[PDB]
Design an enzyme around this catalytic site. Structure first.
Site, PDB file in Angstrom:
ATOM      1  N   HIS A  78       1.660   3.767   2.085  1.00 26.85           N
ATOM      2  CA  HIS A  78       2.311   4.411   3.219  1.00 26.85           C
ATOM      3  C   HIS A  78       3.824   4.220   3.177  1.00 26.85           C
ATOM      4  CE1 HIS A  78      -1.618   3.977   5.754  1.00 26.85           C
ATOM      5  NE2 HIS A  78      -1.586   5.139   5.125  1.00 26.85           N
ATOM      6  N   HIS A 136      -7.023  -1.604   6.385  1.00 28.08           N
ATOM      7  CA  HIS A 136      -6.062  -0.626   6.886  1.00 28.08           C
ATOM      8  C   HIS A 136      -5.971   0.587   5.961  1.00 28.08           C
ATOM      9  CE1 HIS A 136      -2.198   0.931   8.455  1.00 28.08           C
ATOM     10  NE2 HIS A 136      -1.860   1.036   7.184  1.00 28.08           N
ATOM     11  N   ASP A 151       5.939   2.910   5.274  1.00 24.62           N
ATOM     12  CA  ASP A 151       6.556   1.631   5.635  1.00 24.62           C
ATOM     13  C   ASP A 151       6.476   0.613   4.507  1.00 24.62           C
ATOM     14  OD1 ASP A 151       3.757   1.604   6.041  1.00 24.62           O
ATOM     15  OD2 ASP A 151       3.919   0.383   7.846  1.00 24.62           O
ATOM     16  N   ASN A 166      -2.562   3.320  13.667  1.00 32.09           N
ATOM     17  CA  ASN A 166      -3.014   4.454  12.864  1.00 32.09           C
ATOM     18  C   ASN A 166      -4.051   4.011  11.846  1.00 32.09           C
ATOM     19  OD1 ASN A 166      -2.979   6.949  11.134  1.00 32.09           O
ATOM     20  ND2 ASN A 166      -1.702   5.685   9.776  1.00 32.09           N
ATOM     21  N   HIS A 190       0.875  -1.179   0.000  1.00 33.54           N
ATOM     22  CA  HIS A 190       0.000   0.000   0.000  1.00 33.54           C
ATOM     23  C   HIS A 190       0.909   1.226   0.000  1.00 33.54           C
ATOM     24  CE1 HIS A 190       0.368  -0.597   4.433  1.00 33.54           C
ATOM     25  NE2 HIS A 190       0.115   0.688   4.575  1.00 33.54           N
TER      26      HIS A 190
HETATM   27  N1  LIG Z   1       4.474   2.938   9.870  1.00 36.54           N
HETATM   28  C1  LIG Z   1       3.585   2.381  10.854  1.00 36.54           C
HETATM   29  N2  LIG Z   1       2.475   1.758  10.539  1.00 36.54           N
HETATM   30  C2  LIG Z   1       1.744   1.276  11.585  1.00 36.54           C
HETATM   31  C3  LIG Z   1       0.423   0.572  11.292  1.00 36.54           C
HETATM   32  O1  LIG Z   1      -0.538   0.641  12.127  1.00 36.54           O
HETATM   33  O2  LIG Z   1       0.272  -0.025  10.193  1.00 36.54           O
HETATM   34  C4  LIG Z   1       2.277   1.507  12.884  1.00 36.54           C
HETATM   35  C5  LIG Z   1       1.759   1.049  14.261  1.00 36.54           C
HETATM   36  C6  LIG Z   1       2.147  -0.448  14.370  1.00 36.54           C
HETATM   37  C7  LIG Z   1       2.206  -1.132  15.769  1.00 36.54           C
HETATM   38  C8  LIG Z   1       1.482  -0.751  16.924  1.00 36.54           C
HETATM   39  C9  LIG Z   1       1.732  -1.570  18.090  1.00 36.54           C
HETATM   40  C10 LIG Z   1       2.645  -2.621  17.895  1.00 36.54           C
HETATM   41  S1  LIG Z   1       3.129  -2.506  16.267  1.00 36.54           S
HETATM   42  S2  LIG Z   1       3.698   2.380  12.564  1.00 36.54           S
HETATM   43 ZN   LIG Z   2      -0.111   1.712   6.386  1.00 35.35          ZN
HETATM   44 ZN   LIG Z   3       2.013   0.205   8.822  1.00 30.79          ZN
END
Ligand SMILES: Nc1nc(C(=O)O)c(CCc2cccs2)s1
Ligand SMILES: [Zn+2]
Ligand SMILES: [Zn+2]
Length: 231
Positions: free
Chosen positions: A85, A148, A87, A179, A83
């Site tokens: 984002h 997501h 990451d 998020n 996707h």
């Molecule tokens: N770059 C990031 N993406 C996320 C996501 O929600 O996809 C993050 C939070 C991930 C986590 C929360 C608790 C343990 S891992 S950061």
């Molecule tokens: Zn994401």
């Molecule tokens: Zn993520």
């Protein structure tokens, strides 16, 4: 043991062998004042490697390529971002500079552009409708529906029964959401049901962040997501 967030300094990448020819990559990065781990996948593609997702940023993605070269020694020739984002696409410019052909769906490429994120070069056709699957070398790409994010893809490795869920699937220990700025909370349970229907034999399930598990992560994510919409 699978590496945990406190074990990976930001800027380092770990590889974890899941099965013959299948690895996850694990990196760490800051988001809104805390550091989180992030998973992607590496799959042997004949004499080449297929990469699923960046290691969350250009520095981490360079370290990923170096670790792959050191530990596996085959060239990464294609990458798929699941996707838009950071990451998942953050580091695409490093991959491209290194000679990797980068891919994403048209929707992901478009949303990355809108977001001002890095944009994979090539468009993956055949993934525009919920339930669509296409083969991509040694994996299957599947669009389960919005979750997501509205563009999120999952990846399945038939040789090993490995399901990479990306950020649509939570680890078992994660009991709250966020998020979810770009999430579709109404569709997410339905999207998860499609994954379950299409990959009922999955033996290893890898979430976007955290510890792998089995198909129990699907039911677990639905519970978390529903709790978030319940209040
Ligand atoms: N770059 C990031 N993406 C996320 C996501 O929600 O996809 C993050 C939070 C991930 C986590 C929360 C608790 C343990 S891992 S950061
Ligand atoms: Zn994401
Ligand atoms: Zn993520």
């Amino acid at each position: 043991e699978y590496p945990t967030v406190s074990e990976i300094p930001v800027g380092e990448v770990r590889l974890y062998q899941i099965a013959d020819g299948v690895w996850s990559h694990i990196a760490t990065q800051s988001f809104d004042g805390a550091v989180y781990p992030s998973n992607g996948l590496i799959v042997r593609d004949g004499d080449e490697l297929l990469l699923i997702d960046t290691a969350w940023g250009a520095k981490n993605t360079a370290a990923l390529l170096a670790e792959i070269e050191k530990q596996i020694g085959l060239p990464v020739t294609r990458a798929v971002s699941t996707h838009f984002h950071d990451d998942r696409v953050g580091g695409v410019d490093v991959l491209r500079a290194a000679g990797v052909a980068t891919y994403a769906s048209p929707s992901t490429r478009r949303l990355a552009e809108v977001e001002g994120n890095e944009i994979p070069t090539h468009s993956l056709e055949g993934l525009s409708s919920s339930g669509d699957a296409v083969r991509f070398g040694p994996v299957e790409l599947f669009y389960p529906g919005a979750a997501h994010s509205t563009d999120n893809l999952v990846v399945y490795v038939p040789s090993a029964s490995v399901l990479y869920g990306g950020c649509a699937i939570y680890e078992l220990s994660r009991t709250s959401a966020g998020n979810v700025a770009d999430a579709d909370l109404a569709e997410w349970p339905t999207s998860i049901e499609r994954i379950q229907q299409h990959y009922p034999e999955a033996q290893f399930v890898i979430p976007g962040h955290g510890l792998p598990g089995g198909l129990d992560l699907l039911k677990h994510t639905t519970n978390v997501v529903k709790a978030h919409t319940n209040r």
